[PDB]
Design an enzyme around this catalytic site. Structure first.
Site, PDB file in Angstrom:
ATOM      1  N   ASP A  69      -8.656  -0.971  -8.149  1.00  0.00           N
ATOM      2  CA  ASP A  69      -8.010  -1.342  -6.888  1.00  0.00           C
ATOM      3  C   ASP A  69      -7.775  -2.850  -6.822  1.00  0.00           C
ATOM      4  O   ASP A  69      -6.734  -3.309  -6.319  1.00  0.00           O
ATOM      5  CB  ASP A  69      -8.950  -0.888  -5.769  1.00  0.00           C
ATOM      6  CG  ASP A  69      -8.267  -0.630  -4.435  1.00  0.00           C
ATOM      7  OD1 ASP A  69      -7.016  -0.546  -4.312  1.00  0.00           O
ATOM      8  OD2 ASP A  69      -9.048  -0.456  -3.467  1.00  0.00           O
TER       9      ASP A  69
ATOM     10  N   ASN B  77      -4.937  -6.345  -9.793  1.00  0.00           N
ATOM     11  CA  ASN B  77      -3.641  -7.014  -9.941  1.00  0.00           C
ATOM     12  C   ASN B  77      -3.732  -8.352 -10.672  1.00  0.00           C
ATOM     13  O   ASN B  77      -2.892  -8.593 -11.560  1.00  0.00           O
ATOM     14  CB  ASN B  77      -2.912  -7.277  -8.611  1.00  0.00           C
ATOM     15  CG  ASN B  77      -2.693  -6.041  -7.753  1.00  0.00           C
ATOM     16  OD1 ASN B  77      -2.568  -6.175  -6.540  1.00  0.00           O
ATOM     17  ND2 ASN B  77      -2.631  -4.862  -8.356  1.00  0.00           N
TER      18      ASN B  77
ATOM     19  N   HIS C 283       0.815  -1.217   0.000  1.00  0.00           N
ATOM     20  CA  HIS C 283       0.000   0.000   0.000  1.00  0.00           C
ATOM     21  C   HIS C 283       0.852   1.271   0.000  1.00  0.00           C
ATOM     22  O   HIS C 283       0.801   2.099   0.911  1.00  0.00           O
ATOM     23  CB  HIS C 283      -0.965  -0.037   1.177  1.00  0.00           C
ATOM     24  CG  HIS C 283      -2.104  -0.982   0.961  1.00  0.00           C
ATOM     25  ND1 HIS C 283      -2.178  -2.216   1.580  1.00  0.00           N
ATOM     26  CD2 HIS C 283      -3.196  -0.892   0.159  1.00  0.00           C
ATOM     27  CE1 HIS C 283      -3.276  -2.836   1.171  1.00  0.00           C
ATOM     28  NE2 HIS C 283      -3.899  -2.057   0.303  1.00  0.00           N
TER      29      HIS C 283
ATOM     30  N   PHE D  55      -8.811 -15.867  -3.899  1.00  0.00           N
ATOM     31  CA  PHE D  55      -9.019 -14.439  -4.128  1.00  0.00           C
ATOM     32  C   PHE D  55      -9.669 -14.204  -5.482  1.00  0.00           C
ATOM     33  O   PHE D  55     -10.629 -13.435  -5.599  1.00  0.00           O
ATOM     34  CB  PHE D  55      -7.649 -13.746  -4.022  1.00  0.00           C
ATOM     35  CG  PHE D  55      -7.657 -12.235  -4.227  1.00  0.00           C
ATOM     36  CD1 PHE D  55      -8.576 -11.408  -3.594  1.00  0.00           C
ATOM     37  CD2 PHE D  55      -6.660 -11.638  -4.994  1.00  0.00           C
ATOM     38  CE1 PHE D  55      -8.535 -10.014  -3.765  1.00  0.00           C
ATOM     39  CE2 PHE D  55      -6.608 -10.254  -5.158  1.00  0.00           C
ATOM     40  CZ  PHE D  55      -7.552  -9.439  -4.545  1.00  0.00           C
TER      41      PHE D  55
HETATM   42  C1  LIG Z   1      -2.377  -9.659  -5.182  1.00  0.00           C
HETATM   43  O1  LIG Z   1      -3.149 -10.385  -4.226  1.00  0.00           O
HETATM   44  C2  LIG Z   1      -3.896  -9.659  -3.341  1.00  0.00           C
HETATM   45  C3  LIG Z   1      -4.109  -8.300  -3.395  1.00  0.00           C
HETATM   46  C4  LIG Z   1      -4.909  -7.656  -2.447  1.00  0.00           C
HETATM   47  C5  LIG Z   1      -5.499  -8.394  -1.428  1.00  0.00           C
HETATM   48  C6  LIG Z   1      -5.287  -9.782  -1.378  1.00  0.00           C
HETATM   49  C7  LIG Z   1      -4.516 -10.409  -2.329  1.00  0.00           C
HETATM   50  O2  LIG Z   1      -4.241 -11.747  -2.384  1.00  0.00           O
HETATM   51  C8  LIG Z   1      -4.927 -12.598  -1.469  1.00  0.00           C
HETATM   52  C9  LIG Z   1      -6.338  -7.741  -0.358  1.00  0.00           C
HETATM   53  C10 LIG Z   1      -7.806  -8.190  -0.486  1.00  0.00           C
HETATM   54  C11 LIG Z   1      -8.568  -8.156   0.835  1.00  0.00           C
HETATM   55  C12 LIG Z   1      -9.605  -9.231   0.962  1.00  0.00           C
HETATM   56  C13 LIG Z   1     -10.855  -9.113   1.497  1.00  0.00           C
HETATM   57  N1  LIG Z   1     -11.514 -10.311   1.443  1.00  0.00           N
HETATM   58  C14 LIG Z   1     -10.691 -11.248   0.872  1.00  0.00           C
HETATM   59  C15 LIG Z   1     -10.888 -12.597   0.601  1.00  0.00           C
HETATM   60  C16 LIG Z   1      -9.859 -13.287   0.014  1.00  0.00           C
HETATM   61  F1  LIG Z   1     -10.025 -14.613  -0.264  1.00  0.00           F
HETATM   62  C17 LIG Z   1      -8.649 -12.695  -0.315  1.00  0.00           C
HETATM   63  C18 LIG Z   1      -8.452 -11.362  -0.046  1.00  0.00           C
HETATM   64  C19 LIG Z   1      -9.473 -10.608   0.555  1.00  0.00           C
HETATM   65  N2  LIG Z   1      -6.214  -6.271  -0.373  1.00  0.00           N
HETATM   66  C20 LIG Z   1      -5.845  -5.531   0.699  1.00  0.00           C
HETATM   67  O3  LIG Z   1      -5.623  -6.019   1.790  1.00  0.00           O
HETATM   68  C21 LIG Z   1      -6.292  -5.718  -1.729  1.00  0.00           C
HETATM   69  C22 LIG Z   1      -5.093  -6.164  -2.531  1.00  0.00           C
HETATM   70 MG   LIG Z   2      -7.610   0.950   0.579  1.00  0.00          MG
HETATM   71 ZN   LIG Z   3      -5.887   0.309  -2.717  1.00  0.00          ZN
END
Ligand SMILES: COc1cc2c(cc1OC)[C@H](CCc1c[nH]c3cc(F)ccc13)N(C=O)CC2
Ligand SMILES: [Mg+2]
Ligand SMILES: [Zn+2]
Ligand SMILES: COc1cc2c(cc1OC)[C@H](CCc1c[nH]c3cc(F)ccc13)N(C=O)CC2
Ligand SMILES: [Mg+2]
Ligand SMILES: [Zn+2]
EC number: 3.1.4.53
Lengths: 324, 320
Positions: A231, A234, A73, A285
């Protein structure tokens, strides 16, 4: 080096910009140089009478307020979300849909949307009784903070990039930016996606083939989901970019989990470096968050986003293939 | 002191002499009324609150209400606390709320306007204030009241919840936030709509509220009714509240005029109709809310509604 940076910035309209290379070539100023390039590309300085030195001064101060010691971040993430929103705004299905002020709002919201992020989650801040959670009553703690910082920095010396907007324009822009950044709180994702699905199922298209958005609620909903998609973009990027984002988020998560472990707290999901599956976590994810969102966005703008969705699906298959 | 104890015997009655108590207590109505209520409800023993900690917190909290704000001061806070205390005893609400929910409603009432500057959310937004910048124009005052009320628990010997379990503190904090945020007047119409919906779908044996969503909605509307209870009080009390809110409104209008701002409704001392404004306040806000509340607790709110209707008739008679 300046020549190489300028060459890389010619890709600003493309999904898959070499954002990490731009971060290095610009001397760790990816947010400043990418925002400046996008403002020039969209003629925003002339449209809103933004003095160039004011824009650069604000951008450099904003970028400074991202934490250089947070793995995910940081200013590179902000620059990536800005550039991704910029590409999504240019999609054929949205041509001439949004005003210049709405475009400015979406891009500015993207630039500020994670400013001063400490590298830990809202739940960690709530559970540790942090000053931020006390200030914001446990409610969109980080996102309220990002907005407050991003707006407060406009008041620093030679930083008011909106100095020449009308009062009504400033009022409208402020409300739209707040509405957009608050929608980046992941606790709002399910409701935001449910609403986007309803819009897709009921969408209206003009005689020119573009989305018809004839009230504030629908217009802001599209901008909220656009920035939310950026956001969460990725896994939709070329794999060499995606893997770097995965490395970075895992580092940030593992550091949070180390703090939770030391405090005797239950470790948050994906934050335990001793019981992690990076690859299964990416597949989950994508399957539960990123693909449901991007498939719906792709439906809204069909068929504009087909290549992005195809890349997401290929990357899911790639991560899945590493599991067995 | 002897008179003060005598006045505090009416703590369970609508129409407590709260201004007299403010005078008798050395301008500590919030502290003495909260202390009395915590004893009446046995909350110190139920939640193991040390009396010295309670007093220290209450005095600190009361110090953070502004003595130079005519309406949104410690007397208003004490009045809302005591009004909520009475509404929690409505017979139709017997057996609805747990002790933690009772504690949350009372604590929320005590903190619900702390550090109020005497100007509205819209004024804070339009003047580009630090508060509106912090809170992104959304329930600006109410977020601040919560943040101050909770932060003061961290002062020396001020943590009145020190002996609550971890889950109890988490639950109380959430409920208090939900209640105080619901005191933002911009949420009135939605709150009232949901109160009406509950009335239309209500189940009774006495109210039966099985879902937390329904119970917190009743507590939100309850503290909102207490916040909007001035016109339902005996007329001698109500008229003092009218004098105070008009003074606060007029001072906001004076600042708006000196700044060259558009003067807010009811805030222009040179073009005011105090009595017409009270009748409109009752007709459009207070009576619709209290009539719906009265239906929810039918017929337990009748005496309160009777007083409101008598007071509306009187204010109307002062209009020539
Ligand atoms: C490249 O990879 C990532 C990027 C990002 C995340 C997670 C990543 O990889 C698992 C988390 C997601 C939050 C989140 C909320 N519920 C979820 C349920 C899930 F199964 C996984 C993530 C989340 N972020 C910030 O914290 C955004 C960027
Ligand atoms: Mg944020
Ligand atoms: Zn962000
Ligand atoms: C004793 O009398 C009062 C007491 C109070 C108010 C107004 C009073 O008297 C006109 C206002 C009501 C705000 C309000 C929002 N929409 C309204 C519409 C209206 F028609 C009137 C008021 C309001 N308060 C705080 O600011 C609460 C206390
Ligand atoms: Mg209030
Ligand atoms: Zn109040």
């Amino acid at each position: 080096q300046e020549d190489v940076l300028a060459k890389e910035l010619e890709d600003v309209n493309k999904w898959g910009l070499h954002v990490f290379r731009i971060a290095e070539l610009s001397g760790n100023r990816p947010l400043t140089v990418i925002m400046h390039t996008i403002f020039q590309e969209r003629d925003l300085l002339k449209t809103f009478k933004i003095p160039v030195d004011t824009l650069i001064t604000y951008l450099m101060t904003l970028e400074d307020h991202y934490h250089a010691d947070v793995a995910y971040h940081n200013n590179i993430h902000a620059a990536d979300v800005v550039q991704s929103t910029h590409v999504l705004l240019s999609t054929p299905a949205l041509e001439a849909v949004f005003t210049d002020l709405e475009i400015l709002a979406a891009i500015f919201a993207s630039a500020i949307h994670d400013v001063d992020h400490p590298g830990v989650s809202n739940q960690f801040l709530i559970n540790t009784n942090s000053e931020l959670a006390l200030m914001y009553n446990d409610s969109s703690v980080l996102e309220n903070h990002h907005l407050a910082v991003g707006f407060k920095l406009l008041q620093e010396e030679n930083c008011d990039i909106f100095q020449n907007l009308t009062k009504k324009q400033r009022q409208s822009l402020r409300k739209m930016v707040i509405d957009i950044v608050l929608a980046t709180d992941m606790s709002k994702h399910m409701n935001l996606l449910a609403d986007l699905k309803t819009m897709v199922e009921t969408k209206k298209v003009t005689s020119s083939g573009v989305l018809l958005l004839d009230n504030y609620s629908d217009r802001i909903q599209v901008l909220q989901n656009m920035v939310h998609c950026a956001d969460l973009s990725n896994p939709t990027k070329p794999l060499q970019l995606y893997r770097q984002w995965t490395d970075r988020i895992m580092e940030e998560f593992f550091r949070q989990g180390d703090r939770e472990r030391e405090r005797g707290m239950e470790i948050s999901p994906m934050c335990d470096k001793h019981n992690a599956s990076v690859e299964k976590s990416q597949v989950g994810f994508i399957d539960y968050i990123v693909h449901p969102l991007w498939e719906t966005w792709a439906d809204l703008v069909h068929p504009d986003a087909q290549d992005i969705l195809d890349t997401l699906e290929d990357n899911r298959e790639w991560y899945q293939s590493t599991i067995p």
